[PDB]
Structures are given as structure tokens and as C-alpha cells.
Amino acid sequence: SATRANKDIFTLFDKKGQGAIAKDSLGDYLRAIGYNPTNQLVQDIINADSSLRDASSLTLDQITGLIEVNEKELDATT
């Protein structure tokens, strides 16, 4: 995948200018970058993280730790 694509989609979904999109756009963001996972995959990687389990809005730097770190499995979706 490409990190540039994540930056364009994250800021586009960030219509407030705070550097953080709500947690209701996670799946809507993976599709715009190339990932087509499901709620079971999305919920399993979120609730499994004590920091993202209840995070209000992931920042641009937070998504990078969820795409690169899960680059093999998300890319395998596909």
C-alpha cells in the first residue's frame, strides 16, 4: 500500500481541521485506501486495543500504526 493515500483520505474525512476523524469513519477510511475488511475485523483490532477501544477520534498518526502494523492481514483481505 502507500502512506500518501492514507494521508489524503484521513484529512478528507477530517472536515474539522483538528487532525482527528471520529471513530465512525474507520471502515469508511479503509475502503478509500484499499482495505475492504468487515466489522468483525474492524471491531477485533479496535476493542483489542486499550487505547483505540474507546478513542473518540483517531489522529492521522494513529491510523499509520493500524495500517502498516496490519499491512499483511488487511492487504490479504483482497
**Tell me, what CATH number does 46's domain have?**
1.10.238.10
Name the residue type at position 64. T
The residues facing 21 across adjacent strands are 58
CB 47 within 8 Å of CB 53 = yes
CA separation, residue 68 to residues 7, 16, 18, 20, 22 (Å)? 13, 25, 23, 18, 20
What range defines the domain where residue 48 resides? 1-78
If one counts every other C-beta atom within 10 angstroms of the C-beta of residue 36, the result is 10
Helical pair 26-33 and 39-47, crossing angle rounded to 10 deg: 120
14 is in an annotated binding site: yes
